Design a protein around this motif. Structure first.
Motif, mmCIF file in Angstrom:
data_model
loop_
_atom_site.group_PDB
_atom_site.id
_atom_site.type_symbol
_atom_site.label_atom_id
_atom_site.label_comp_id
_atom_site.label_asym_id
_atom_site.label_seq_id
_atom_site.Cartn_x
_atom_site.Cartn_y
_atom_site.Cartn_z
ATOM 1 N N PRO A 52 0.841 -1.197 0.000
ATOM 2 C CA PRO A 52 0.000 0.000 0.000
ATOM 3 C C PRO A 52 0.881 1.254 0.000
ATOM 4 O O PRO A 52 1.937 1.287 0.646
ATOM 5 N N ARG A 53 0.494 2.290 -0.729
ATOM 6 C CA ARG A 53 1.330 3.476 -0.822
ATOM 7 C C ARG A 53 1.479 4.142 0.540
ATOM 8 O O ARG A 53 0.493 4.399 1.237
ATOM 9 N N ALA A 54 2.722 4.459 0.883
ATOM 10 C CA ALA A 54 3.026 5.122 2.138
ATOM 11 C C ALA A 54 2.262 6.425 2.296
ATOM 12 O O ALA A 54 2.154 7.228 1.365
ATOM 13 N N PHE A 58 3.196 15.455 4.131
ATOM 14 C CA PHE A 58 3.243 16.751 3.464
ATOM 15 C C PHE A 58 3.661 16.508 2.035
ATOM 16 O O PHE A 58 4.782 16.080 1.781
ATOM 17 N N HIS A 59 2.742 16.771 1.122
ATOM 18 C CA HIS A 59 2.946 16.749 -0.322
ATOM 19 C C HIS A 59 2.999 18.205 -0.753
ATOM 20 O O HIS A 59 2.008 18.929 -0.611
ATOM 21 N N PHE A 60 4.147 18.633 -1.272
ATOM 22 C CA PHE A 60 4.413 20.007 -1.709
ATOM 23 C C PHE A 60 4.643 19.936 -3.213
ATOM 24 O O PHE A 60 5.645 19.374 -3.668
ATOM 25 N N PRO A 62 4.555 21.936 -6.696
ATOM 26 C CA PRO A 62 4.508 22.990 -7.713
ATOM 27 C C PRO A 62 4.025 22.440 -9.054
ATOM 28 O O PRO A 62 4.490 21.402 -9.531
ATOM 29 N N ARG A 63 3.126 23.200 -9.701
ATOM 30 C CA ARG A 63 2.564 22.881 -11.012
ATOM 31 C C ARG A 63 2.756 24.107 -11.897
ATOM 32 O O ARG A 63 2.578 25.242 -11.451
ATOM 33 N N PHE A 64 3.116 23.897 -13.151
ATOM 34 C CA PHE A 64 3.579 24.998 -13.984
ATOM 35 C C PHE A 64 2.649 25.394 -15.108
ATOM 36 O O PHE A 64 2.897 26.421 -15.750
HETATM 37 C C1 LIG Z 1 -1.555 14.403 -11.838
HETATM 38 C C2 LIG Z 1 -2.367 13.901 -11.151
HETATM 39 C C3 LIG Z 1 -3.333 13.232 -10.287
HETATM 40 O O1 LIG Z 1 -2.829 13.030 -8.966
HETATM 41 C C4 LIG Z 1 -2.579 14.192 -8.179
HETATM 42 C C5 LIG Z 1 -1.717 13.744 -7.013
HETATM 43 O O2 LIG Z 1 -0.432 13.333 -7.463
HETATM 44 C C6 LIG Z 1 -0.233 11.924 -7.385
HETATM 45 C C7 LIG Z 1 1.155 11.603 -7.794
HETATM 46 N N1 LIG Z 1 2.032 11.032 -6.998
HETATM 47 C C8 LIG Z 1 3.173 10.868 -7.784
HETATM 48 C C9 LIG Z 1 4.403 10.291 -7.482
HETATM 49 C C10 LIG Z 1 5.378 10.225 -8.465
HETATM 50 C C11 LIG Z 1 5.146 10.728 -9.749
HETATM 51 C C12 LIG Z 1 6.229 10.664 -10.799
HETATM 52 O O3 LIG Z 1 6.078 11.341 -11.846
HETATM 53 O O4 LIG Z 1 7.233 9.943 -10.554
HETATM 54 C C13 LIG Z 1 3.915 11.305 -10.058
HETATM 55 C C14 LIG Z 1 2.948 11.361 -9.064
HETATM 56 N N2 LIG Z 1 1.641 11.831 -9.055
HETATM 57 C C15 LIG Z 1 0.936 12.404 -10.204
HETATM 58 C C16 LIG Z 1 -1.523 14.872 -6.021
HETATM 59 O O5 LIG Z 1 -0.760 15.908 -6.634
HETATM 60 C C17 LIG Z 1 -2.897 15.370 -5.589
HETATM 61 C C18 LIG Z 1 -2.829 16.495 -4.583
HETATM 62 O O6 LIG Z 1 -4.113 16.880 -4.126
HETATM 63 O O7 LIG Z 1 -3.622 15.856 -6.734
HETATM 64 C C19 LIG Z 1 -3.879 14.844 -7.706
HETATM 65 S S1 LIG Z 1 -5.077 13.588 -7.145
HETATM 66 C C20 LIG Z 1 -6.405 14.665 -6.669
HETATM 67 C C21 LIG Z 1 -7.222 15.270 -7.620
HETATM 68 C C22 LIG Z 1 -8.253 16.107 -7.222
HETATM 69 C C23 LIG Z 1 -8.473 16.341 -5.873
HETATM 70 CL CL1 LIG Z 1 -9.773 17.377 -5.374
HETATM 71 C C24 LIG Z 1 -7.658 15.736 -4.932
HETATM 72 CL CL2 LIG Z 1 -7.936 15.965 -3.244
HETATM 73 C C25 LIG Z 1 -6.630 14.904 -5.321
#
Ligand SMILES: C#CCO[C@@H]1[C@@H](OCc2nc3ccc(C(=O)O)cc3n2C)[C@@H](O)[C@@H](CO)O[C@@H]1Sc1ccc(Cl)c(Cl)c1
Ligand SMILES: C#CCO[C@@H]1[C@@H](OCc2nc3ccc(C(=O)O)cc3n2C)[C@@H](O)[C@@H](CO)O[C@@H]1Sc1ccc(Cl)c(Cl)c1
Ligand SMILES: [Cl-]
Lengths: 149, 149
Positions: A52-54, A58-60, A62-64
């Protein structure tokens, strides 16, 4: 004086954090955003398992795309909580950065290039964090810590 | 403003209008009268008096002798193991601000900006829907910051 300073880790990076994230602890991450980056993330995790994913305390993230933003969230039992979206973002494709995450008793305080960026209240106790994950389209020049212990 | 109440009569019993999700804060400001014996803040599953509602988190400052705080849980009218904090910031005729931070596995409580105690969940926090405050205490305000908002 930073501790456990490493350089140019391969991305994705998953590393065990070398001491506890007690209040006052800093995580210092220097890097740059590639020209074709869509997003990257710094995840403070309870464990390193992918299944199961850990939990991610805190997930930080940035989106561009478009004007850009930073999304912060927590993953508990493989479910994301409420997104906290910061639209005032210091990051830019092709710009170098220094992220400083300060652990406080009740929140994280993040500064970029010496300027306050955001606060994020704890949802998982920070003593449960033992793993630093850095994923996505990013180059990390260095990682170091300042432990408060 | 729907999530705050000022100057409630004690005893106070109120329905919590949203879930105590991890990240949620409960902020209680007040003052202990000069003759106080004890007061308590109870996070409850319902408001029944007969049979008495379960108390997920009973936070109970006591003023006799050198003072302490007792924390416990009431399930089906049975109290569990007391967790006693001897390092207490409460005193007769002194004001306080309590901050209860709901985390995944515990409550983290700080009073007047200083860490006070932790209390691991014994009842899932999703079952809490009621806040009670009882005993010899004056409450100036109760506010919630829900992590879903
Ligand atoms: C893109 C995309 C979809 O997913 C992200 C999450 O990201 C998951 C993630 N974990 C990763 C680990 C490694 C890598 C890689 O490239 O190696 C990529 C990864 N991605 C995309 C997160 O950002 C999450 C943060 O809230 O947002 C979405 S899910 C989501 C959507 C709507 C709502 Cl409303 C809510 Cl609450 C949540
Ligand atoms: C005093 C007293 C006795 O009872 C308290 C419990 O308090 C009950 C309570 N609920 C109230 C609601 C409202 C008011 C009011 O004034 O309006 C007063 C209330 N009181 C006293 C609790 O503090 C409980 C916490 O563990 O401790 C005792 S029972 C008890 C005793 C020994 C052990 Cl070893 C263990 Cl485990 C348990
Ligand atoms: Cl926790």
């Amino acid at each position: 004086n930073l501790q456990n300073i490493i350089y140019n880790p391969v991305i994705p990076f998953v590393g065990t954090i070398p001491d506890q994230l007690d209040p006052g602890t800093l995580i210092v991450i220097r890097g740059h955003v590639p020209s074709d980056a869509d997003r990257f993330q710094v995840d403070l995790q309870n464990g390193s398992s992918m299944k199961p994913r850990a939990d991610v305390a805190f997930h930080f993230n940035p989106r561009f795309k478009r004007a850009g933003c930073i999304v912060c969230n927590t993953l508990i039992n493989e479910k994301w909580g409420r997104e906290e979206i910061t639209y005032d973002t210091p990051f830019k494709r092709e710009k170098s950065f220094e992220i400083v995450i300060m652990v406080l008793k009740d929140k994280f305080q993040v500064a970029v290039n010496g300027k306050h960026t955001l606060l994020y209240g704890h949802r998982i106790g920070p003593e449960k964090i033992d793993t630093l994950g850095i994923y996505g389209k990013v180059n990390i020049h260095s990682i170091g810590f300042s432990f408060s212990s």
